[PDB]
Amino acid sequence: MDDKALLVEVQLLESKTYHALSNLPKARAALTSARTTANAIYCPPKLQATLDMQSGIIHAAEEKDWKTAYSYFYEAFEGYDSIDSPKAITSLKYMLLCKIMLNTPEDVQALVSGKLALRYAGRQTEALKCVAQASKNRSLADFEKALTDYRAELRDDPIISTHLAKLYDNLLEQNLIRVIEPFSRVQIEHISSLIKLSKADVERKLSQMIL
Amino acid sequence: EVKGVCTEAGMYALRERRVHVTQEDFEMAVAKVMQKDSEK
Amino acid sequence: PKNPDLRIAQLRFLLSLPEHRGDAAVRDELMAAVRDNNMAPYYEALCKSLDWQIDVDLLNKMKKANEDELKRLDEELEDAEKNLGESEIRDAMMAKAEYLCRIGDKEGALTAFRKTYDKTVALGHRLDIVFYLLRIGLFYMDNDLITRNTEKAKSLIEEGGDWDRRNRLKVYQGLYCVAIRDFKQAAELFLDTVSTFTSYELMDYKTFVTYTVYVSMIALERPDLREKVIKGAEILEVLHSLPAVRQYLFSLYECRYSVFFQSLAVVEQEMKKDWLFAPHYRYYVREMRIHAYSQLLESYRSLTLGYMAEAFGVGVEFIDQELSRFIAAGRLHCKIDKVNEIVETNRPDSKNWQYQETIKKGDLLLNRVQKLSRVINM
Amino acid sequence: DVLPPEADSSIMMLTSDQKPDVMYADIGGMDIQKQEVREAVELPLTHFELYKQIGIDPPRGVLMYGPPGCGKTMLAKAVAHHTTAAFIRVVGSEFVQKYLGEGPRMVRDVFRLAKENAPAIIFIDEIDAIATKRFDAQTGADREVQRILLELLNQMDGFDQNVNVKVIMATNRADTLDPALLRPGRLDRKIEFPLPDRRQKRLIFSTITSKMNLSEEVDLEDYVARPDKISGADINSICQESGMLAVRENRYIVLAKDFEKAYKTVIKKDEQEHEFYK
Amino acid sequence: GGRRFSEGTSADREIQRTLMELLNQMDGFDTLHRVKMIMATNRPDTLDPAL
Amino acid sequence: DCTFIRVSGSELVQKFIGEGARMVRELFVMAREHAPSIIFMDE
Amino acid sequence: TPNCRVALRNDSYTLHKILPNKVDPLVSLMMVEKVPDSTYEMIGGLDKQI
Ligand SMILES: Nc1ncnc2c1ncn2[C@@H]1O[C@H](COP(=O)(O)OP(=O)(O)OP(=O)(O)O)[C@@H](O)[C@H]1O
Numbered sequence A: 001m002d003d004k005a006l007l008v009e010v011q012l013l014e015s016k017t018y019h020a021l022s023n024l025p026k027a028r029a030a031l032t033s034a035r036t037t038a039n040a041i042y043c044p045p046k047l048q049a050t051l052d053m054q055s056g057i058i059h060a061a062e063e064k065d066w067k068t069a070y071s072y073f074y075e076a077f078e079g080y081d082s083i084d085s086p087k088a089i090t091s092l093k094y095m096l097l098c099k100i101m102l103n104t105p106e107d108v109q110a111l112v113s114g115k116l117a118l119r120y121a122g123r124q125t126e127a128l129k130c131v132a133q134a135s136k137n138r139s140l141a142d143f144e145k146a147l148t149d150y151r152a153e154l155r156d157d158p159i160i161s162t163h164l165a166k167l168y169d170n171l172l173e174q175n176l177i178r179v180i181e182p183f184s185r186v187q188i189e190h191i192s193s194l195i196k197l198s199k200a201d202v203e204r205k206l207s208q209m210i211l
Numbered sequence B: 001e002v003k004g005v006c007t008e009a010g011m012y013a014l015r016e017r018r019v020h021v022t023q024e025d026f027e028m029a030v031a032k033v034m035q036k037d038s039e040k
Numbered sequence C: 001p002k003n004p005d006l007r008i009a010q011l012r013f014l015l016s017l018p019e020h021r022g023d024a025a026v027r028d029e030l031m032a033a034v035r036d037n038n039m040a041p042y043y044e045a046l047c048k049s050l051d052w053q054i055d056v057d058l059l060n061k062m063k064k065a066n067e068d069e070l071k072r073l074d075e076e077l078e079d080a081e082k083n084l085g086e087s088e089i090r091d092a093m094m095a096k097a098e099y100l101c102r103i104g105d106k107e108g109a110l111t112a113f114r115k116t117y118d119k120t121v122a123l124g125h126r127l128d129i130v131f132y133l134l135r136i137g138l139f140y141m142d143n144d145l146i147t148r149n150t151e152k153a154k155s156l157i158e159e160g161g162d163w164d165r166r167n168r169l170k171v172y173q174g175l176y177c178v179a180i181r182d183f184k185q186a187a188e189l190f191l192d193t194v195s196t197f198t199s200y201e202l203m204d205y206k207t208f209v210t211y212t213v214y215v216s217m218i219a220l221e222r223p224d225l226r227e228k229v230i231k232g233a234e235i236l237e238v239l240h241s242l243p244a245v246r247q248y249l250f251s252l253y254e255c256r257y258s259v260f261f262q263s264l265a266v267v268e269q270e271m272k273k274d275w276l277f278a279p280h281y282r283y284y285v286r287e288m289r290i291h292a293y294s295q296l297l298e299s300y301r302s303l304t305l306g307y308m309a310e311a312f313g314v315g316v317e318f319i320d321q322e323l324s325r326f327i328a329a330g331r332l333h334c335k336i337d338k339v340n341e342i343v344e345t346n347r348p349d350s351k352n353w354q355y356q357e358t359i360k361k362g363d364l365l366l367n368r369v370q371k372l373s374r375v376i377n378m
Numbered sequence D: 001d002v003l004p005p006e007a008d009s010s011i012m013m014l015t016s017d018q019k020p021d022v023m024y025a026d027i028g029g030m031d032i033q034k035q036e037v038r039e040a041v042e043l044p045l046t047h048f049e050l051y052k053q054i055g056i057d058p059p060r061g062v063l064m065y066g067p068p069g070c071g072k073t074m075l076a077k078a079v080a081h082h083t084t085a086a087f088i089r090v091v092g093s094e095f096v097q098k099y100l101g102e103g104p105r106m107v108r109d110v111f112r113l114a115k116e117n118a119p120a121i122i123f124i125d126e127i128d129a130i131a132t133k134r135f136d137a138q139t140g141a142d143r144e145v146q147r148i149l150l151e152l153l154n155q156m157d158g159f160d161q162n163v164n165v166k167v168i169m170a171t172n173r174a175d176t177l178d179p180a181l182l183r184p185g186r187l188d189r190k191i192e193f194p195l196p197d198r199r200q201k202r203l204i205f206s207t208i209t210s211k212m213n214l215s216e217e218v219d220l221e222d223y224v225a226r227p228d229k230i231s232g233a234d235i236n237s238i239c240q241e242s243g244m245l246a247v248r249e250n251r252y253i254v255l256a257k258d259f260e261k262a263y264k265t266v267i268k269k270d271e272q273e274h275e276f277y278k
Numbered sequence E: 001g002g003r004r005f006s007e008g009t010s011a012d013r014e015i016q017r018t019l020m021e022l023l024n025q026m027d028g029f030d031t032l033h034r035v036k037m038i039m040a041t042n043r044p045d046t047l048d049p050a051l
Numbered sequence F: 001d002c003t004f005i006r007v008s009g010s011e012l013v014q015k016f017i018g019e020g021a022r023m024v025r026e027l028f029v030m031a032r033e034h035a036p037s038i039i040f041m042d043e
Numbered sequence G: 001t002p003n004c005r006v007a008l009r010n011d012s013y014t015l016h017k018i019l020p021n022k023v024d025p026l027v028s029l030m031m032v033e034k035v036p037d038s039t040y041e042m043i044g045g046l047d048k049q050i
């Protein structure tokens, strides 16, 4: 029939529901069909940023290029700027979780201190600042209290529950070079005592570093 | 337009910092070059 | 044509060198030898074969058909020059000399390819002629003629992009650098495995995947195996159909050391019977053993030698004689003790071993130029 | 004896008090052209290897054109502010010097200065003073200009795809150009700056009126809704006039009555629209 | 001033060069500060729209 | 092997054919000197 | 040759030496226009018009 713009919506909605029902390469194609369809509409006034969000979701769902996936969540928030407050505040989460995944933890506070993001204050932007602060001081126990405080918005999203376990490994070795740094030969019984973690798993994890 | 598309397919590959041109870049290139065909 | 032509050279290897296995190989090659007009490349193969006493009419029915294609070229060369195209004599047999390249030997090919090289003003036929000269120079192992036209190939690609003539070309050095014992080049020429197409010579793409993984585990260390061939979706899913080679690569990565030797015995047996790795299959594992040894040995310092029996490979005395010959070889930096039953390692600096290879090349180039200046000037 | 290179016109854009300090955020609503001038000017300047690696032949020079007052001179100012390369800025009506042979010497030492210095960027404005169509080999004032164009058409051919010299050129009338200048190998990329209509129009009101008071209540969307063919060079003067209309009343805060008097003052079209036609 | 032409005579070659030098020196890459311009004509029909 | 000459009637070209070239036919002096030549014309 | 450069002394204007080959004006003409030099190998699907 006549329309073209509503085809973009139903292809984007199928792109939601193959990913959330755990089928990535079928969700990859249904996104691309919405990519090649939205390239012909003269006015995508608001649906562009809605497509720009899951242009970043599925492209970060395989974790190949976080830098270009960060560029999608920026534009999806620029399109959500000052016109749609529920969709905008979640767009702060996907850019700064990516930035901690990018391992530039100080730049998280540099954005939210910016005057465009000073307006969108709330609970979930504080859920990112504490975790960025936890990865800033580079400690395991600093990460744990930030999870337990803001669990209602941190450990609730269906992609965060996937991306926390990969971030935990990176911050495990980030505190592990921190405490090991100031010395020479040392015992293994103290580094387990200074991380509050076991000895057999640490020793294998230490062995992976020198390999 | 064939040399218009096949040159422009590199511009999609270069704007996402790839080094190989892929089959989804060509079909994204058709919908823009034929869009200008649909303009006047 | 030269497109099914490499399987012939594999089956000639399949004929002669497995000595007991010479019955079905002399049948299925003769299934293709005395058809498709092949005349020249199997006289001495017939000498390595049995008698096959009546081949005379078998040759006469084919050398006639060789002449039949040759005489219609002799009926073409006067009708093409009368009302000329772009020298349509040459332009006809610039596609029919590759027949004569397969049928006759290189001489009908080389005098006709260098003929038609000067005909076409664009490289798009020239650079395809050069791929023919490369391919016959692998059959007759023309190691001095491939050095000429490879530069003459590569000098053509710079004008234009020619990536179906560059990425195609990279496979040829990738098969040549693994023909010679040069593995850090062969994995580098096999770096892509993305633009590498479902070709004619590795008609399975998955056989190309086996060749690019067997060389990749030698050439590079593990900051790069842990990024490139463990994370490539182009390389994971093609060995996802392979139970052995997925296990063969990951056992070194997962530190499953005992099952590493198990599948290595399969591959090294397979590497013996494979063509083009059989010149260097005994060079492979002795580099893969010492690669497997030093990875485990450089993590610890006070490892006992009897720990490696039940966790790395059985036989304590088998570990004993094998480490004894590699420290004596001047590699595998550790120092085994005997009568308190422990293996102690060291860490030498990257000066003396870097110094050691310099004094080799300095003697070798001085060997070259001293011998040269005696020959020239009387 | 051989010399270091030298020119008088221009020198090298002295880099301290020479940037015209306009940033990318000033130019409101030019999303295609801000993006597409990047791919032709400074993205091959820095990321040269990807163009070499894919093999897509980066453009030598670019011709930007359109109706007057569409940010042609403005977008060149912002490129020169955020560059990392040398920027060479010439006016294209200074090659007509009085003495003969000055001009062809004046052309060839620009690119020699663009060679020796850097991976630089040449910017020539009002090429209509040089590149026209019609000539007359009887006057001498027209025999000179014909030798001017045969220099830079020769000098743009003397590149080897290795030096990173980009030539941005901007005109107002593309009709009075010889198509010898627009052959591939010399000028391959053509950018028009069309006139903004409504979607790009409301973005220009946002960036201009961000600086002034504009008290609290004055609407801007009620002026974007109207028709009638407004440039980008007069939306500035809608706001430039209305501020003076408030300063005249000794009133330092913009009212909504000021914008109504200022809108009908700038454009001043009558109708040209005898209604019985439709 | 003039408008422009499709280049009829040889004279208005070098006047449009003299005109386009004026257009650039007004607002091309220079802070045009404290320099006010006043122009007068009987008929503004024949003016270049770029001016 | 033909000297592919195209004419557009331009005037930068004009100084290499002749000083006034009151005809177009003065092109043939350069054409009959590269004798197996081809003249080309656009729309 | 007619239309060939020379060197030339200046005291007596005596001919000195042949100065090589400058240009044909036809060569400069096509050099200005820059036609896209092509071949049959880049012709896409026009076999009957060839
Ligand atoms: N975002 C904008 N888009 C378009 N024009 C703008 C914008 N912001 C300001 N302007 C105004 O447009 C005017 C024209 O700038 P510029 O000189 O670049 O246009 P132009 O196309 O070069 O016109 P001309 O060629 O006649 O000089 C500027 O003086 C400025 O006042």
Ligand SMILES: [Mg+2]
Pocket: D072, D073
């Ligand atoms: Mg301007």
